[PDB]
RNA sequence: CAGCCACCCGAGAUUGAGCAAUAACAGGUCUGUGAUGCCCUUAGAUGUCCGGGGCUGCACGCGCGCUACACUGACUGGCUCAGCGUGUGCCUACCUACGCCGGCAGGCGCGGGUAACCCGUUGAACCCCAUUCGUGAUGGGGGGGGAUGCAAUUAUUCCCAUGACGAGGAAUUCCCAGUAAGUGCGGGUCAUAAGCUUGCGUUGAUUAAGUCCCUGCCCUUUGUACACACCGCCCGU
RNA sequence: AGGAGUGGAGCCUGCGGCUUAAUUUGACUCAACACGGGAAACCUCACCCGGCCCGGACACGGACAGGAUUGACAGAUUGAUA
């Protein structure tokens, strides 16, 4: 019954990697902001939070039950051993994905990428972030793939 | 798509009795992990999966060696029509709201 | 001093099984020359040795200048 | 590599071709001085096969798949 | 535990083996006490991130 | 018979089929600790588990 | 002149009496019928060697016995058959003799002439 | 003045790595990935199903991989020392005490433990040599079989044999105090190590406290008809 | 200044034309060679066969539903094992 620590830590890393890749694959449309997982005695749980609280919670509970069944049936989880908790937002120290999604789904419906860059820059520095960088790699004007990197604010790279 | 239909109706029946189901894609396996002690050829069921996802009734998804279903109102209704399930069955995943 | 058969020098050699310690020039090296059969049946080792190709994996793709100038 | 020009040997194989009557006449045998169908072929005790499988008498070898007894006419 | 990871998939550039550390820290406590007191002390909605296991050998 | 018609060949040293499961590739797999993840995602989920660099 | 015999035992001596004496001294390459397990494909192979050495008329070259995934040879009884191994383009022709025992019958399969001792690559002055 | 050297002190009067600019390379990765420049992609085959011949085939032909290369040492053992590498896994199955047949494994219950519990005080490496080799290519590296997996094969992975090299092709190789090398312990395939590699010990050092020479990068001044920027520009037959 | 001072001698998966279909590249002189953290018959070949399934849903043509991969046994038989 007894298990070591390193091996189950790596197994939890596997589970975390798969859940997060699946999450970033699907849930990018509905405005999720911060997602985590937590542990209770013989019980695992996944928690999500966003500005669109009930929207991420979903309609008819389809997302909740569907993805919980997915993880339950894939990761050897015994039935019922996954649930969703609740939380709330403290402040705006993690405000990137809201404007990122805004620009993304403006561009998907028809919008210039650099207009979105202007907007996201100005909203991010109105929010109070110190500095922001957006690197769009590919073709923007012509068939030369220039990695258009837009910086603003300060960026340190050296130190603990 | 060349699996005898008895396994097809069995898989559909267990699908609707359980809801969604999982899929592992590999030809080298002798017997299915969850469907063990039955000796079901995996290639045929894989073709059935890609056919039903190409037929346009469950949103086709290729997710990194491990496949799941995409359940919706339209998908459930189509499965009900295709398996001719009685007009009294409700999936166990929607219990107690 | 009772040297065992598997310990013996010509242990279970080809043609005939002899356990006597006899050493004479003229025919002993011919007994060591059991290569007659292997080269005659043109086995894998024999079909290598027809041209003089290595049979122990020594990587001599273009090296081997010792004695080959 | 280049395309092998796969017509010199076996360009493509076609499906199995057989000649079958719309209503089976070869599987059932008549002429046994009976007003109804008479089963002259001896039934095999192996029930693992299907009910519609008709036991045949072949001159050489056996083609069943699971049991394949050995017998002859002599 | 040390783990070391090459980064350039194809050989192109330096041999920058990412050296990552997994340093696990362990504390033991053996107790001769009534069960209720230590159960109340311990089962107090423990902090996440620290793993506790009770053993009877 | 049936054992030669189909599936007369196993692979008991299989690494390709029993490769890193969470993504769709074989390389970047080390069999310690049950990794089943490439080095690129090994780093992408390193600090999340608790990995730190000091050397 | 003098013929060569393996431990003083010739083809008739290896053929008539079974390997009750070679039970411990049987070679590698699937000796493990006692330690790992027993495998198939020596039954239709036995039937086909019976067929090949039963209907064969004397004074002509016997039937080409074709092998793509080369079979295992377990006894020199099959000596007397023209074996065609799959080198990829033609028949690797082998006429088996009692001197083949203890080998893999695919070992006489080569699919390339030795590299021509001609010219090197274009840029050989480095 | 910033500072620098020596000395007295102190465990330490500079220990190593970690994080590591703005901007760019028309670099690698779609072979980490079903979003992405694509004529055969109308499911005609690279694997699904087979694994034969070989990157083990030969000529300067680019590749640290070459242990060892002999009286400093090769033999046999009297011998005396931390790896602080780590070694029992939800669809995991690969880490011989107590007795013996043996050159290895092979085992019959059987590798003590999910670990500082069980491997353990992990007796592995230059050593008072425990017969021999007092100056020479020699004692100095040195073709059949008994058995992990479906198959030892150009011995992949144990038993007897038929023992170039001279400090070594002209050789864009690292290194300044526990450091170069030797040697040893392990981890990456794990069906049992890795000829490399990654960590760690042991033995352990001679010159240095300097300088632009011959190598690269950088700065200042200067010239330019160059700006795709000298792999430039350009003139004439 | 100095130690290995390499390569000099048989001494990695990769490795240049590389005769055969093949012992090739996806990296090309501080940006190709311990390269995709390969103990190479394979997943420890991409260049090789053929049996192994022929991915076609979406308007509709064919008897205007039975055109059988999935069933092995001494002659057929590009392995009798399809």
From Swiss-Prot, chain B:
<keyword id="KW-1017">Isopeptide bond</keyword>
<dbReference type="GO" id="GO:0045202">
    <property type="term" value="C:synapse"/>
</dbReference>
<dbReference type="GO" id="GO:0005829">
    <property type="term" value="C:cytosol"/>
</dbReference>
<comment type="subunit">
    <text>Component of the small ribosomal subunit. The methylated form interacts with NPM1.</text>
</comment>
<keyword id="KW-0597">Phosphoprotein</keyword>
<keyword id="KW-0539">Nucleus</keyword>
<dbReference type="GO" id="GO:0016020">
    <property type="term" value="C:membrane"/>
</dbReference>
<dbReference type="GO" id="GO:0006412">
    <property type="term" value="P:translation"/>
</dbReference>
<keyword id="KW-0488">Methylation</keyword>
<keyword id="KW-0689">Ribosomal protein</keyword>
<comment type="function">
    <text>Component of the 40S ribosomal subunit. The ribosome is a large ribonucleoprotein complex responsible for the synthesis of proteins in the cell.</text>
</comment>
<comment type="similarity">
    <text>Belongs to the eukaryotic ribosomal protein eS10 family.</text>
</comment>
From Swiss-Prot, chain D:
<feature type="zinc finger region" description="C4-type">
    <location>
        <begin position="44"/>
        <end position="67"/>
    </location>
</feature>
<feature type="region of interest" description="Disordered">
    <location>
        <begin position="1"/>
        <end position="18"/>
    </location>
</feature>
<feature type="modified residue" description="N6-acetyllysine">
    <location>
        <position position="36"/>
    </location>
</feature>
<feature type="modified residue" description="N6-acetyllysine">
    <location>
        <position position="27"/>
    </location>
</feature>
<protein>
    <recommendedName>
        <fullName>Small ribosomal subunit protein eS31</fullName>
    </recommendedName>
</protein>
<comment type="function">
    <text>Component of the 40S subunit of the ribosome. Part of the small subunit (SSU) processome, first precursor of the small eukaryotic ribosomal subunit. During the assembly of the SSU processome in the nucleolus, many ribosome biogenesis factors, an RNA chaperone and ribosomal proteins associate with the nascent pre-rRNA and work in concert to generate RNA folding, modifications, rearrangements and cleavage as well as targeted degradation of pre-ribosomal RNA by the RNA exosome.</text>
</comment>
<feature type="cross-link" description="Glycyl lysine isopeptide (Lys-Gly) (interchain with G-Cter in ubiquitin)">
    <location>
        <position position="30"/>
    </location>
</feature>
<comment type="subunit">
    <text>Part of the 40S ribosomal subunit. Part of the small subunit (SSU) processome, composed of more than 70 proteins and the RNA chaperone small nucleolar RNA (snoRNA) U3.</text>
</comment>
<feature type="cross-link" description="Glycyl lysine isopeptide (Lys-Gly) (interchain with G-Cter in ubiquitin)">
    <location>
        <position position="36"/>
    </location>
</feature>
Curated annotation (Swiss-Prot), chain E:
<feature type="modified residue" description="Phosphoserine">
    <location>
        <position position="33"/>
    </location>
</feature>
<feature type="modified residue" description="N6-acetyllysine">
    <location>
        <position position="15"/>
    </location>
</feature>
<comment type="function">
    <text>Component of the small ribosomal subunit. The ribosome is a large ribonucleoprotein complex responsible for the synthesis of proteins in the cell.</text>
</comment>
<comment type="similarity">
    <text>Belongs to the universal ribosomal protein uS10 family.</text>
</comment>
<comment type="subunit">
    <text>Component of the 40S small ribosomal subunit.</text>
</comment>
<protein>
    <recommendedName>
        <fullName>Small ribosomal subunit protein uS10</fullName>
    </recommendedName>
</protein>
Swiss-Prot record, chain G:
<dbReference type="GO" id="GO:0000028">
    <property type="term" value="P:ribosomal small subunit assembly"/>
</dbReference>
<keyword id="KW-0832">Ubl conjugation</keyword>
<keyword id="KW-1017">Isopeptide bond</keyword>
<dbReference type="GO" id="GO:0002181">
    <property type="term" value="P:cytoplasmic translation"/>
</dbReference>
<feature type="cross-link" description="Glycyl lysine isopeptide (Lys-Gly) (interchain with G-Cter in SUMO2)">
    <location>
        <position position="97"/>
    </location>
</feature>
<keyword id="KW-0963">Cytoplasm</keyword>
<dbReference type="GO" id="GO:1901798">
    <property type="term" value="P:positive regulation of signal transduction by p53 class mediator"/>
</dbReference>
<dbReference type="GO" id="GO:0005829">
    <property type="term" value="C:cytosol"/>
</dbReference>
<dbReference type="InterPro" id="IPR005713">
    <property type="entry name" value="Ribosomal_uS19_euk/arc"/>
</dbReference>
<keyword id="KW-0687">Ribonucleoprotein</keyword>
<dbReference type="GO" id="GO:0005634">
    <property type="term" value="C:nucleus"/>
</dbReference>
<dbReference type="GO" id="GO:0022626">
    <property type="term" value="C:cytosolic ribosome"/>
</dbReference>
